[PDB]
Design an enzyme around this catalytic site. Structure first.
Site, short mmCIF file in Angstrom:
data_model
loop_
_atom_site.label_atom_id
_atom_site.label_comp_id
_atom_site.label_asym_id
_atom_site.label_seq_id
_atom_site.Cartn_x
_atom_site.Cartn_y
_atom_site.Cartn_z
N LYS A 225 48.40 26.84 -30.27
CA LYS A 225 49.38 27.42 -30.95
C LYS A 225 49.51 28.74 -30.99
O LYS A 225 48.58 29.65 -30.39
CB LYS A 225 49.40 26.71 -32.39
N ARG B 246 42.81 17.87 -32.80
CA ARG B 246 43.83 17.60 -31.91
C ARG B 246 43.99 18.57 -30.82
O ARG B 246 44.62 19.81 -31.42
CB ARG B 246 45.33 17.52 -32.73
#
Length: 253
Positions: A196, A232
């Site tokens: 991210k 994750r």
């Protein structure tokens, strides 16, 4: 206990998805088998980010039916109870609600109806009247209690700080600096930072998403030491091996 490794299985190409052979069921089954060999405890099927319920089921149900029989927990990204219930009937174990049940309150009674787990992710449009950490805790604690009212045990109510959602890069750094306060909620915490924009800020130089796997693994080791119970990640093998060593060293304490 062991830190769970949640592998990301995207059915559509996105900016953080790497090699693209997407929306093929036979390829998804092959990728799921590869993730299980790399150490994935959970397979997270990507979902919608204004299609109908029948359209959203048509997206996920082909892949779900083909991978639900494997020896790995299946997690589906959906925030509407009609989609979650049809997936839970097929045998999926986890419902990853990226709205923490704020979009459809019936999600709690549906997940409890099938004795499954739910992931509550902190989300929003970025607006808040309080600091991010207090606003995140206030929102997640209230939604975690709603699943608790519906009958879901606390060890099955996962809390995701929602890195990359409703936060500036500085606000994400405030959350990552105070992960102990979210772990202090005694709910299992799912850290989701893989590739991210926050991991790009960890690099002093410009990077591609794949080049952010090593600093993603750094957040994994940092998160496990802070008390998170799952991560994750895209790179299952790198994080699973690193998590195994950190789990050995943290329980050694």
């Amino acid at each position: 206990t062991k830190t769970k490794i949640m592998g990301i299985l995207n059915v559509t190409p996105d900016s953080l998805s790497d090699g693209g052979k997407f929306n093929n069921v036979e390829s998804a089954v092959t990728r799921v088998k590869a993730m299980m060999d790399e150490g994935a405890d959970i397979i997270d099927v990507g979902g919608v980010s204004m299609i109908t319920v029948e359209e959203e089921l048509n997206r996920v149900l082909p892949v779900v039916e083909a991978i639900v029989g494997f020896d790995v927990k299946i997690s589906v990204d959906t925030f509407r109870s009609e989609v979650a219930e049809a997936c839970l009937k097929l045998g999926v174990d986890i419902i990853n609600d990226q709205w923490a049940g704020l979009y459809d309150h019936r999600m709690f009674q549906v997940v409890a109806k099938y004795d499954a787990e739910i992931v509550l992710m902190h989300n929003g449009n970025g607006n808040r009247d309080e600091p991010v950490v207090e606003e995140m805790l206030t929102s997640l604690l209230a939604q975690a209690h709603q699943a608790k009212i519906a009958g879901i045990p606390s060890n099955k109510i996962w809390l995701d700080p929602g890195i990359g959602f409703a936060k500036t890069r500085n606000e994400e750094a405030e959350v990552m600096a105070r992960l102990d306060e979210l772990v202090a909620t005694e709910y299992p915490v799912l850290l989701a930072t893989s590739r991210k924009r926050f991991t790009k800020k960890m690099m002093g130089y410009d990077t591609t998403p794949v080049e952010r796997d090593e600093v993603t693994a750094a957040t994994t080791a940092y998160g496990i030491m802070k008390g998170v119970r799952a991560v994750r990640v895209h790179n299952v093998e790198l994080n699973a091996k690193l998590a195994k060593g950190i789990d050995f060293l943290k329980e050694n304490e």
